[PDB]
Design an enzyme around this catalytic site. Structure first.
Site, PDB file in Angstrom:
ATOM      1  N   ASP A   1      45.024 -30.947 -27.086  1.00 25.35           N
ATOM      2  CA  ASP A   1      46.459 -30.924 -26.836  1.00 25.35           C
ATOM      3  C   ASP A   1      47.121 -29.870 -27.732  1.00 25.35           C
ATOM      4  OD1 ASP A   1      46.492 -32.189 -29.247  1.00 25.35           O
ATOM      5  OD2 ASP A   1      47.382 -34.040 -28.509  1.00 25.35           O
TER       6      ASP A   1
ATOM      7  N   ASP B   1      44.209 -39.005 -20.165  1.00 30.40           N
ATOM      8  CA  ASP B   1      43.734 -39.307 -21.511  1.00 30.40           C
ATOM      9  C   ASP B   1      44.633 -40.391 -22.051  1.00 30.40           C
ATOM     10  OD1 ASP B   1      46.085 -37.188 -22.272  1.00 30.40           O
ATOM     11  OD2 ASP B   1      45.672 -38.449 -24.009  1.00 30.40           O
TER      12      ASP B   1
ATOM     13  N   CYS C   1      30.301 -55.373 -15.478  1.00 38.20           N
ATOM     14  CA  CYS C   1      30.148 -54.141 -16.241  1.00 38.20           C
ATOM     15  C   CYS C   1      28.691 -53.805 -16.544  1.00 38.20           C
ATOM     16  CB  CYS C   1      30.924 -54.278 -17.548  1.00 38.20           C
ATOM     17  SG  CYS C   1      30.872 -52.831 -18.592  1.00 38.20           S
TER      18      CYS C   1
ATOM     19  N   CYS D   1      27.683 -51.666 -18.827  1.00 36.35           N
ATOM     20  CA  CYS D   1      27.541 -51.063 -20.150  1.00 36.35           C
ATOM     21  C   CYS D   1      26.516 -51.773 -21.038  1.00 36.35           C
ATOM     22  CB  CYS D   1      28.901 -50.905 -20.855  1.00 36.35           C
ATOM     23  SG  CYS D   1      29.372 -52.245 -21.977  1.00 36.35           S
TER      24      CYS D   1
ATOM     25  N   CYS E   1      27.639 -55.154 -22.599  1.00 36.11           N
ATOM     26  CA  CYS E   1      27.583 -56.301 -21.698  1.00 36.11           C
ATOM     27  C   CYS E   1      26.157 -56.695 -21.311  1.00 36.11           C
ATOM     28  CB  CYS E   1      28.455 -56.046 -20.468  1.00 36.11           C
ATOM     29  SG  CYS E   1      30.209 -55.965 -20.902  1.00 36.11           S
TER      30      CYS E   1
ATOM     31  N   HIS F   1      32.373 -50.699 -24.867  1.00 39.14           N
ATOM     32  CA  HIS F   1      32.645 -51.386 -23.613  1.00 39.14           C
ATOM     33  C   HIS F   1      33.918 -50.853 -22.950  1.00 39.14           C
ATOM     34  CE1 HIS F   1      33.687 -54.335 -20.586  1.00 39.14           C
ATOM     35  NE2 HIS F   1      34.876 -54.376 -21.162  1.00 39.14           N
TER      36      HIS F   1
HETATM   37  N1  PRF Z   1      52.944 -38.555 -22.520  1.00 47.17           N
HETATM   38  C1  PRF Z   1      53.462 -37.215 -22.716  1.00 47.17           C
HETATM   39  C2  PRF Z   1      52.525 -36.431 -23.597  1.00 47.17           C
HETATM   40  C3  PRF Z   1      51.375 -36.869 -24.256  1.00 47.17           C
HETATM   41  N2  PRF Z   1      50.792 -35.844 -24.961  1.00 47.17           N
HETATM   42  C4  PRF Z   1      51.516 -34.718 -24.799  1.00 47.17           C
HETATM   43  N3  PRF Z   1      51.313 -33.493 -25.322  1.00 47.17           N
HETATM   44  C5  PRF Z   1      52.192 -32.503 -25.015  1.00 47.17           C
HETATM   45  N4  PRF Z   1      51.989 -31.274 -25.544  1.00 47.17           N
HETATM   46  N5  PRF Z   1      53.275 -32.696 -24.205  1.00 47.17           N
HETATM   47  C6  PRF Z   1      53.570 -33.890 -23.641  1.00 47.17           C
HETATM   48  O1  PRF Z   1      54.560 -34.059 -22.893  1.00 47.17           O
HETATM   49  C7  PRF Z   1      52.656 -35.005 -23.937  1.00 47.17           C
HETATM   50 ZN    ZN Z   2      30.757 -53.709 -20.778  1.00 42.43          ZN
END
Ligand code: PRF
Ligand code: ZN
Ligand code: PRF
Ligand code: ZN
EC number: 2.4.2.29
Lengths: 369, 369
Positions: free
Chosen positions: A92, A266, A304, A306, A309, A335
């Protein structure tokens, strides 16, 4: 494999399934990416993360820049080598953690919560850090407006984010090794406002990215509103590129978002809530700390596949979590991530077979029974 | 396999190497037993414990009786099933934790440190708890005198321990399933006093046990004194049965104790100090938190065959431990237990080849260089 290629194999309504090919591997979509905060998916070896079915993990630029440091990781050979995960990594940009300190059109300056030292983030520095880490999917640096936002403030932040998206694009492109080997995603902003979401989509498409994230959601608005915004926002994005909903989420949020055209997810939920005692099951979440599980010999979930489990009971995991044992965190996390991957596999298979709408209905009926 | 059979394959001076065969498996001696406090070897799955080379683990009667409870474990199928370790388990009797509250010739009553509830331990109850857990090697319940001890108090505690050893023997023998499937070890007491150690050895041999522990050491006396007491104490025990030194210890303590005739060891050191940042190496222990390791790409130890040293650097583990990451505890613990098992293997091989004295000298020269 190419630097980046997204192919859609099957569709059902707005839902899609397919693959992203990258140099370090193939990512099956819709995809769930476990979150590696500070160069570890908490309580799991990378081989265990892979064994659950994960094709890609997320690393947090903000945290990694604070500890152990981006330049340090680069000196040590990059994030993949450092943590022992050789498949794709998405990083990110830091925009979210900045919202979660001086702000300007140039970027932000802030104090480390760990040491009090001063740090800077900007489109250029964020892209540079992501390069130093060696991540495969790089995110543009944006400004994330809190929810709720007034139309004026949502517009100002969206407009700044679009200027920063162009700066991110140019920073990425100016670095030959990064441009040739990694991919760059843009982030749509605009809060809950359709006209702003459209302006943002148009700006990002004009710049051009390898993928498009829907930013600024899951910020307090609730599922109904989030779904409403996705209803109009996702179709604004280029159809032939992946659509990534950042920071989502619960299993039901994922299913509904896929119904609305999202390809990538994510969230810290399966890992973080795993450590707290929450286990996901097809019949809904359970909290394994509850006394009712103290002599329950069944696995966490009845279907499951995994390893947890296969081998251990609710009663044992109940004891470990109550006792604060590390193995409890390990087993709960494995899990939960495995559960999420099985959910994504069922989603992919049902779309491929033209029965995703039925799957979504059946999933909800049982999960919320 | 038989209920219990100890065979000595090779000797060098007082040192021995061989095997203990039991129904659940073979134990190679000299053996190191990782400690599973509350039904888990901290931060490791049982398969990982086994992969390091461990043949047997230790469970703590005192802790298990407090949480999750002995009767509960029995209801759930016993400790092996509960925690997923199918090889032999030795359980201690509780005598040590009682020292670490009303005492009498009948036994002890005490308050749980967890809940404040009142609990009782006695030779009969300790043997019963160890039965409920299903352990393979059961320890007699003793009274452990603190160090230093006056001759009078050491004698009184030793004499009580011998009366309790007979009670433990009778309790064990009266339970058919336990007598037929498990083994019972007696514990020598007597502090640092040769005459008391002799009286204790004579009493235990008269009663008759499957194995004999040297109790009451590593209580503050220091290595020189501990070795001095082992010099005279171990030869007092029956030669044809295993000799177990409880709560020892550091690698150098283990080597010296094997030189003096000890066959079995347990200690929390590799697990506990692993979580704290201490890693064992052939060149002595290191503390991975030290800043000097922040960019060190070498494995924890240059020769270690463990999976951690195959895959991750000092720099990475340094980061994990500094960050308080669970994976740091996992990796440090796996390496330390693997190191201990490699030490035991080198000890066994050198005795088998008649070069243990040389190994001990070479080990010390390098470990303390
Ligand atoms: N849930 C919004 C969000 C999560 N992570 C993020 N990272 C960035 N750069 N911008 C975003 O708007 C978001
Ligand atoms: Zn499991
Ligand atoms: N180091 C001495 C020791 C450790 N654990 C023990 N357990 C018992 N029952 N008795 C003992 O003397 C000891
Ligand atoms: Zn190692």
């Amino acid at each position: 494999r190419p630097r980046f290629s997204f192919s859609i194999a099957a569709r059902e309504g707005k839902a899609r399934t397919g693959t992203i090919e990258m140099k370090r591997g193939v990512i099956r979509t819709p995809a769930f990416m476990p979150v590696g905060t500070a160069a570890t998916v908490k309580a799991l070896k990378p081989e265990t993360v892979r064994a659950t079915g994960a094709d890609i993990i997320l690393g947090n630029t903000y945290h990694l820049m604070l500890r152990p440091g981006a330049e340090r990781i680069a000196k040590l050979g990059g994030l993949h080598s450092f943590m022992g995960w050789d498949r794709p990594i998405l990083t990110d940009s830091g925009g979210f953690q900045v919202m979660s300190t001086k702000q300007s059109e140039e970027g932000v300056t802030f104090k480390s919560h760990l040491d009090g030292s001063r740090h800077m983030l900007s489109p250029e520095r964020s892209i540079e850090i992501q390069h130093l880490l060696g991540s495969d999917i790089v995110m543009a640096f944006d400004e994330v407006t809190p929810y709720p936002a007034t139309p004026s403030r949502a517009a100002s932040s969206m407009e700044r984010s679009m200027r920063w998206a162009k700066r991110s694009r140019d920073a990425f492109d100016s670095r030959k090794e990064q441009a040739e080997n990694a991919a760059l995603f843009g982030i749509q902003q605009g809060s809950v406002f359709e006209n702003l979401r459209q302006q943002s989509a148009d700006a990002l498409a004009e710049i051009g990215f390898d993928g498009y994230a829907v930013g600024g959601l899951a910020g307090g608005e609730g599922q109904d509103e989030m779904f409403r915004v996705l209803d109009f926002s996702v179709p604004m994005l280029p159809d032939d590129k992946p659509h990534y909903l950042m920071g989502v989420g619960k299993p039901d949020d994922i299913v509904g978002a896929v119904e609305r055209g999202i390809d990538m997810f994510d969230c810290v939920l399966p890992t973080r809530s795993g450590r707290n005692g929450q286990a996901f099951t097809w019949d809904g979440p359970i909290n394994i700390r509850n006394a009712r599980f103290s002599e329950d010999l069944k696995p966490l979930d009845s279907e499951c596949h995994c390893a947890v489990c296969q081998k251990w009971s609710r009663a044992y995991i109940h004891h470990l979590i109550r006792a604060g044992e590390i193995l409890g965190a390990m087993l709960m996390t494995e899990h939960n991530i495995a559960f999420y991957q099985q959910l994504m596999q069922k989603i992919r298979d049902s779309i491929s077979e033209g029965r995703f709408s039925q799957f979504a209905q059946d999933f909800r009926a049982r999960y919320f029974a």
